[PDB]
Design an enzyme around this catalytic site. Sequence first.
Site, PDB file in Angstrom:
ATOM      1  N   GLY A 199      73.748 -32.205   5.926  1.00 23.31           N
ATOM      2  CA  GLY A 199      73.921 -32.167   7.369  1.00 23.31           C
ATOM      3  C   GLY A 199      73.252 -33.366   8.021  1.00 23.31           C
ATOM      4  O   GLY A 199      72.287 -33.934   7.498  1.00 23.31           O
ATOM      5  N   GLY A 207      77.664 -44.230  10.879  1.00 24.18           N
ATOM      6  CA  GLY A 207      76.807 -44.862   9.894  1.00 24.18           C
ATOM      7  C   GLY A 207      76.984 -44.316   8.486  1.00 24.18           C
ATOM      8  O   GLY A 207      77.080 -45.066   7.516  1.00 24.18           O
ATOM      9  N   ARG A 214      72.109 -43.102   2.612  1.00 26.47           N
ATOM     10  CA  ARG A 214      71.122 -44.110   2.243  1.00 26.47           C
ATOM     11  C   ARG A 214      69.724 -43.509   2.107  1.00 26.47           C
ATOM     12  O   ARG A 214      69.426 -42.470   2.700  1.00 26.47           O
ATOM     13  CB  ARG A 214      71.091 -45.190   3.324  1.00 26.47           C
ATOM     14  N   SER A 240      71.561 -26.993   5.224  1.00 26.07           N
ATOM     15  CA  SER A 240      72.013 -28.319   5.688  1.00 26.07           C
ATOM     16  C   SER A 240      72.482 -28.322   7.147  1.00 26.07           C
ATOM     17  O   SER A 240      72.224 -29.286   7.874  1.00 26.07           O
ATOM     18  CB  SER A 240      73.091 -28.916   4.770  1.00 26.07           C
ATOM     19  N   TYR A 243      70.245 -29.206   9.974  1.00 27.51           N
ATOM     20  CA  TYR A 243      70.004 -30.645  10.196  1.00 27.51           C
ATOM     21  C   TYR A 243      71.099 -31.308  11.028  1.00 27.51           C
ATOM     22  O   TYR A 243      71.052 -32.513  11.273  1.00 27.51           O
ATOM     23  CB  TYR A 243      69.807 -31.385   8.874  1.00 27.51           C
ATOM     24  N   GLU A 326      66.405 -27.420  -2.770  1.00 26.60           N
ATOM     25  CA  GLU A 326      66.919 -28.697  -2.303  1.00 26.60           C
ATOM     26  C   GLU A 326      66.947 -29.679  -3.450  1.00 26.60           C
ATOM     27  O   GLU A 326      66.134 -29.609  -4.394  1.00 26.60           O
ATOM     28  CB  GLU A 326      66.194 -29.214  -1.051  1.00 26.60           C
TER      29      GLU A 326
HETATM   30  C1  LIG Z   1      62.510 -37.049   7.384  1.00 19.79           C
HETATM   31  O1  LIG Z   1      63.616 -36.494   6.654  1.00 19.79           O
HETATM   32  C2  LIG Z   1      63.190 -35.998   5.385  1.00 19.79           C
HETATM   33  C3  LIG Z   1      64.383 -35.272   4.757  1.00 19.79           C
HETATM   34  C4  LIG Z   1      64.690 -34.025   5.556  1.00 19.79           C
HETATM   35  N1  LIG Z   1      65.650 -33.182   4.839  1.00 19.79           N
HETATM   36  C5  LIG Z   1      65.356 -32.251   3.875  1.00 19.79           C
HETATM   37  C6  LIG Z   1      66.617 -31.674   3.464  1.00 19.79           C
HETATM   38  C7  LIG Z   1      66.826 -30.677   2.508  1.00 19.79           C
HETATM   39  C8  LIG Z   1      68.098 -30.203   2.238  1.00 19.79           C
HETATM   40  C9  LIG Z   1      69.180 -30.739   2.940  1.00 19.79           C
HETATM   41  C10 LIG Z   1      68.987 -31.727   3.919  1.00 19.79           C
HETATM   42  C11 LIG Z   1      70.192 -32.224   4.661  1.00 19.79           C
HETATM   43  N2  LIG Z   1      70.106 -33.212   5.552  1.00 19.79           N
HETATM   44  O2  LIG Z   1      71.252 -31.640   4.510  1.00 19.79           O
HETATM   45  C12 LIG Z   1      67.685 -32.188   4.159  1.00 19.79           C
HETATM   46  C13 LIG Z   1      66.978 -33.162   5.026  1.00 19.79           C
HETATM   47  O3  LIG Z   1      67.585 -33.934   5.861  1.00 19.79           O
END
Ligand SMILES: COCCCN1Cc2cccc(C(N)=O)c2C1=O
Length: 351
Positions: A199, A207, A214, A240, A243, A326
């Site tokens: 997410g 992007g 990235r 997800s 986020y 995760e």
């Molecule tokens: C500062 O950002 C650190 C990462 C933060 N995290 C942890 C995480 C766990 C599982 C899924 C996702 C996702 N974006 O789908 C994310 C995420 O963005």
Amino acid sequence: ESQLDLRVQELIKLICNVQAMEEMMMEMKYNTKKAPLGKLTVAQIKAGYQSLKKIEDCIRAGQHGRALMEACNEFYTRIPHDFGLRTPPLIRTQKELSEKIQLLEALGDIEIAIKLVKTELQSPEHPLDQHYRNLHCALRPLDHESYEFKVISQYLQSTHAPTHSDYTMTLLDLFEVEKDGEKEAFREDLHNRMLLWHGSRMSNWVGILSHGLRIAPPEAPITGYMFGKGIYFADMSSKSANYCFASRLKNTGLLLLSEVALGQCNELLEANPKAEGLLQGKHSTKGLGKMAPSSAHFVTLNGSTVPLGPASDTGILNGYTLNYNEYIVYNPNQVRMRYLLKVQFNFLQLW
Ligand SMILES: COCCCN1Cc2cccc(C(N)=O)c2C1=O
């Protein structure tokens, strides 16, 4: 007139909307008036991350007084915020530091987006079509009657965690994703390929689709990344989806499904921002959740295992314990973006 399928037209119109990006940054307290998004530079963003390091230093030493105030003021000078008449809030917790990292990630994706949406001075193509071409990422809509729609719908619903009860999700449209170059770069040799969720905020999709997922840059605070500077995925759709930071006001978000070549997982009970150093030959980190989909229910889709729900106990318990798994990979060549879901969030105001 656009030559795109209407589903793709609506998707492109949504993600390429500069005013929506402005509004999203304003909601995050970034001062779009004084520091226009069009004038923000990669150097300015890099300096923002560096100032977060100084804040991180204060947080990791539990220094919450004048030293923290000064470090936060430095960050706010580099990355202008709009706090009205109020004293600027301090950045005191790992959570608050993560929100600022998220802001800088969004700003970097918007910097990319603003360049990308520039149209040709004279052109036979509709603007939507130019934006689409400039992504260098094919987006092919799938019919709702289709098998792929059925399985992805099932994945989305069956892995919506019961502890994420503040909303439901409805799948509005589904696109097959083929990013230029990703097939060629992919570690198709690695085993343990899984179709996993990612997410992100709405400002970030131009992007992500144009540059791929990235890793964080070297200048970012190390302890802002609980398993290190990799690309993070979930096997629970709602983990997800959280986020996406959708809201009642902006209740359409996107979720990405990608084929992730996990290879040998390094399984970790506890957070460790230095996790990448612990791989010692292994190809990914798995943060071990209390609850997860179980193998009995898994299906396959285009060579990737789909971990269909519901979630149940994994036998894992700790200190802190992750609610859900995760997965982290540390090279984009372990990712092949595959599906993009346009999701309507239906918020329940529970009390
Ligand atoms: C500062 O950002 C650190 C990462 C933060 N995290 C942890 C995480 C766990 C599982 C899924 C996702 C996702 N974006 O789908 C994310 C995420 O963005």
